[PDB]
């Protein structure tokens, strides 16, 4: 059944480890694979978290936010690094509605590959926590980091794929977060910022994340990362240094798609607040649904942030409609947003008129 479809898609070397491990062809349509997976592999999501690889606290808060929203969490899945910690945290949370983890790890890296349900116990090995594991190989054991191209193509298609739920102009957020100072991560960041994908990075402790956070010409880049990445600078040849300068210049070109979170702030729930602010900035940059105040209000309200939301739209003062949030306030009551309907009342609406007999009966 599914095995035949998987074999035909490549046009095998595929097996289920037990969540689902699949080998994909580089010259394949990411759209078709995503559609097939959504139809059969798993359900649909409104939000998809993109991972590009005190800090543990921030990652745990992000994991909790993703679980509450039900968003997909894309990650490399490498055993060595924060991927193992994220997998352990996801397993612990699932032990206690459903969290799904996706690993993008090319088959070439794995040193123990076998062709029903093959069992592996334990180079470049990976964590088994992730439910779905997609491995993109070029056809040889050359250890190339080519899966990033397929990852970016899939992310771009998913962003293109409109989603009715969660508003955001019928689109998906594709939040991007990186904390590791890798050249491949920098290339992925450049490609993403080239697109509409928004990336948010916390100062934390990163080889390049700290440099970019402090940043927010050749001489300026030379001064930057001088102490942050001494080993990287020493190892990188002149061509590599010029490539670094070019990539960082391209990345810094766009500030709307770049979000910086300071590690000094001790505020609670800042992990979600920063993401909300970045998503709002991207939505404002979109300018398509920005004309409709209600549309941006829906996306703003669905998230925790309310303080900046009040200034953004609730401040208004240009011309507030008498009906105002005819349905937005109704959704807020249904959504049960605390300390937010208070602003609707402060601006004010006819409580008797707002609560129509049909609306009251429906509630």
């Amino acid at each position: 059944d599914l095995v035949n479809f998987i074999q035909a898609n490549f046009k095998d070397a595929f097996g289920d480890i037990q969540g689902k491990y699949l080998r994909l062809s580089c010259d394949t349509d990411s759209e078709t694979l995503y559609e097939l997976l959504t139809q059969h592999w798993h359900l649909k999501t409104p939000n998809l978290v993109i991972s590009v690889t005190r800090m543990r606290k921030i990652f745990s808060r992000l994991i909790y936010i993703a679980q509450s929203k039900g968003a997909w969490i894309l990650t490399g899945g490498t055993h060595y690094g924060l991927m193992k910690y994220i997998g352990e945290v996801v397993r612990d949370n699932t032990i206690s509605e459903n969290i799904v983890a996706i690993g993008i790890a090319a088959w070439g890296m794995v040193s123990n590959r076998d062709t029903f349900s093959a069992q592996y116990i334990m180079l470049y090995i990976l964590d088994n926590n992730h439910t779905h594991l997609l491995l993109v190989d070029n056809g040889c054991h050359g250890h190339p980091t080519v899966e990033a191209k397929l990852r970016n193509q899939l992310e771009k298609y998913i962003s293109e794929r409109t989603s009715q739920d969660s508003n955001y102009g019928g689109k998906i957020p594709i939040v991007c977060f990186a904390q590791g100072g890798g050249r491949e991560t920098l290339k992925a960041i450049n490609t993403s910022v080239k697109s509409k994908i928004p990336c948010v990075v916390v100062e934390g402790s990163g080889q390049i994340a700290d440099v970019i956070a402090s940043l927010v010409t050749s001489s300026m880049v030379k001064e930057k990362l001088v102490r942050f990445l001494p080993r990287t600078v020493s190892r990188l040849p002149e061509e590599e240094i010029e490539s670094w300068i070019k990539w960082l210049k391209e990345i810094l070109e766009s500030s709307h798609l770049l979000t910086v979170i300071k590690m000094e702030e001790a505020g609670d729930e800042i992990v979600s607040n920063a993401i909300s602010y970045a998503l709002y900035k991207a939505f404002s940059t979109n300018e398509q649904d920005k004309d409709n105040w209600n549309g941006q209000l829906k996306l703003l309200l669905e998230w925790n942030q309310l303080d900046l939301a009040s200034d953004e739209i609730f401040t208004n003062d240009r011309r507030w409609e008498s009906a105002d949030l005819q349905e937005v306030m109704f959704t807020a009551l249904i959504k049960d947003r605390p300390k937010f309907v208070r602003l609707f009342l402060e601006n004010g609406l006819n409580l008797q008129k707002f609560l129509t007999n049909e609306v009251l009966t429906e509630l």
Binding site: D92, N93, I95, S96
Partner: protein
Amino acid sequence: WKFQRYFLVQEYCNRLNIPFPFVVFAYFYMVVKKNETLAWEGVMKENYL
């Protein structure tokens, strides 16, 4: 008092349930014959910390 309460429970948990006259017969017959929770606890401990 609460502490003392436990004891009686334990005692009546050791003997289970048996009427006294059938209790004697049951005693004679007996003489003749004679993981995930830990993970949840760890998560709760992390929350407590």
